[PDB]
Design a protein around this ligand. Sequence first.
Ligand SMILES: O=C(Nc1cnccc1-c1ccccc1)c1ccnc(NC(=O)C2CC2)c1
Length: 345
Amino acid sequence: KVTTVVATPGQGPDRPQEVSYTDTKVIGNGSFGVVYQAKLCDSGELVAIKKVLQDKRFKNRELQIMRKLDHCNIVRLRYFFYSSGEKKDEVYLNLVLDYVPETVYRVARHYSRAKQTLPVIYVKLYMYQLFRSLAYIHSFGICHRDIKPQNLLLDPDTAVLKLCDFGSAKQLVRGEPNVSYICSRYYRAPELIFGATDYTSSIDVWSAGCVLAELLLGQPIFPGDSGVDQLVEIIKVLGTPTREQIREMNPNFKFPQIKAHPWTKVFRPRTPPEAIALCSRLLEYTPTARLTPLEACAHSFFDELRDPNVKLPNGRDTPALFNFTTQELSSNPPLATILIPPHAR
Ligand SMILES: O=C(Nc1cnccc1-c1ccccc1)c1ccnc(NC(=O)C2CC2)c1
């Protein structure tokens, strides 16, 4: 019925509170553990509870990253607490998060299975907000490392996107090596497939680019169940990478010598050229030639979002889009002139 636990608020001072919740049910199972959904008694608010086994040795990295995060496009840690339950005398970490009812995956799938495309204004709204969350976490040196449609939460009434699952997220320091086997199926950057250990935070941007193409195409842009297949699909668009381009990703195989497909010809006829242009500047072999998250926010493809008259198809106003903080703009402070339009309060 009602479950009452003593939970530590995520943000703020470490002062634990009795928190009660009912209607608990399962909404996810995975390598990480299990996610529940329940209703808070004192508010009626829906929450998602992510339950993971707690490493006895070290502190949980996800918890420590999520406790440092505060941004309108990242899912909020409301509380966290510790429980028992299975394994063998082990401790479980429970991350209590704001429940968001939808994901880009489920929504993209509705449209693909209905054979329409997701309206571009949603592509603008969703992609812009993803790039904001990245601008933010990247300013801390934190790379998400598993950006994909299932990790992009959506509230279809407000058009708010929230990035979730920081289970793979890590701070990337120059000269410190990092595992290359992060990141999922269709969204791995070529330098990961090639097994680079010196990759940078632009892998997230490659991934984001894959989401954008997919929202435009109605299907993944680089499918394949092996790296080899994914790589072949990549070369079919970007063309065969050059010696310099290969070096910028890795050592040490020749490839199909196939010339580039004209990016205008990779998408449906009605596709906006600003979107095709933004794709081409995210999906670059050379990981330093890719746009930064903040630069992409400032991209012309998103200009419509900065129009004073724009509204959601449901009639409502657009959600927070311009509350940039100094931290978020740090990559490139002068972009504020473009990012914060005259009407934004
Ligand atoms: O953190 C979350 N999940 C996760 C955390 N870590 C890893 C994976 C997930 C996850 C699990 C299932 C679906 C989407 C994400 C999480 C947080 C808030 N809302 C949702 N909502 C939903 O799942 C919507 C009903 C679809 C998921």
